Amino acid sequence: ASTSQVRQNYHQDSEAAINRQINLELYASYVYLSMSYYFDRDDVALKNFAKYFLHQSHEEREHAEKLMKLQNQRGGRIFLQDIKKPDCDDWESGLNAMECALHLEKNVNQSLLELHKLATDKNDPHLCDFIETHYLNEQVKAIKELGDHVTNLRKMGAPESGLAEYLFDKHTLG
Ligand SMILES: [Cl-]
Ligand SMILES: [Cl-]
Ligand SMILES: [Cl-]
Ligand SMILES: [Cl-]
Ligand SMILES: [Cl-]
Ligand SMILES: [Fe+3]
Ligand SMILES: [Fe+3]
Ligand SMILES: [Mg+2]
Ligand SMILES: [Mg+2]
Ligand SMILES: [Mg+2]
Ligand SMILES: [Mg+2]
Ligand SMILES: [Mg+2]
Ligand SMILES: [Mg+2]
């Protein structure tokens, strides 16, 4: 029940919301790791899908670490939960994995916008600027890129066309 010497204008609800955001960023990292190694399978074998999702996985881990840094910067206390296994074992195709990534990045975005509404209600301009600076445009860019990718795969004839996924792997992701 004693307070951080650095803590100023940092609401307990914001502190809680940051810890929930940290768990969601580590979850995203885990989903992207899972997708990566699906495409490394001998019966899928799209090495540039695998490389693309592994890079996304490492990105999500940096998102988590920056939130852990912020928690400490503001004098909050990190509280960790189980990282849940990803919601798909089989991802069936390039298109389907990109579709799942798009839904994930939209879920992560919806959580960040909720976090921003809270920071606004608690009048925390530093936490607002942090979220705007480091997260909101990264999400908008990521969602747009996955949108683009999903559209290319669909137009090329995925997931029926194994040729479309092969060529997309070489031209877009290579
Ligand atoms: Cl405070
Ligand atoms: Cl408080
Ligand atoms: Cl837990
Ligand atoms: Cl931009
Ligand atoms: Cl070429
Ligand atoms: Fe993220
Ligand atoms: Fe070609
Ligand atoms: Mg291999
Ligand atoms: Mg990303
Ligand atoms: Mg479970
Ligand atoms: Mg503002
Ligand atoms: Mg600003
Ligand atoms: Mg700045």
Numbering used by the authors: 3 to 176
What does the published report state?
In eukaryotes and in some bacteria Ft is made-up of 24 subunits that naturally self-assemble to form a nanocage structure. The cage has octahedral symmetry, with external and internal diameters of 12 nm and 8 nm, respectively. H chains exert ferroxidase activity and have a high affinity for the TfR1 transferrin receptor, over-expressed on the surface of different cancer cell lines.
We also performed the encapsulation of TRIL, a 13-residue antimicrobial peptide, demonstrating that polypeptides can also be loaded within the nanocage obtaining nanoparticles amenable for further structural and functional studies. With the aim to verify if the developed disassembly/reassembly protocol can be used also to encapsulate peptides within the hHFt nanocage, TRIL and hHFt previously disassembled in SDS were mixed at a molar ratio of 1/1 peptide/protein subunit, as described in detail in the experimental section. Finally, to obtain a structural description of the TRIL-hHFt system, crystals were grown, and X-ray diffraction data were collected. The crystals diffract X-rays to 2.3 Å resolution, i.e., a resolution significantly lower than that of the Ru1-hHFt and hHFtSDS crystals that diffracted to 1.57 and 1.52 Å, respectively. The structure of TRIL-hHFt was solved and refined up to Rfactor and Rfree values of 0.171 and 0.223. Also in this case, the protein cage is perfectly reconstituted upon the encapsulation protocol and the peptide is not visible in the electron density map. The spectra show that TRIL-hHFt possesses the same secondary structure of the untreated hHFt, thus indicating a correct protein refolding. Notably, SDS was not detected in the X-ray structures of the empty hHFt reconstituted after disassembly, nor in the nanocages loaded with Ru1 or TRIL.
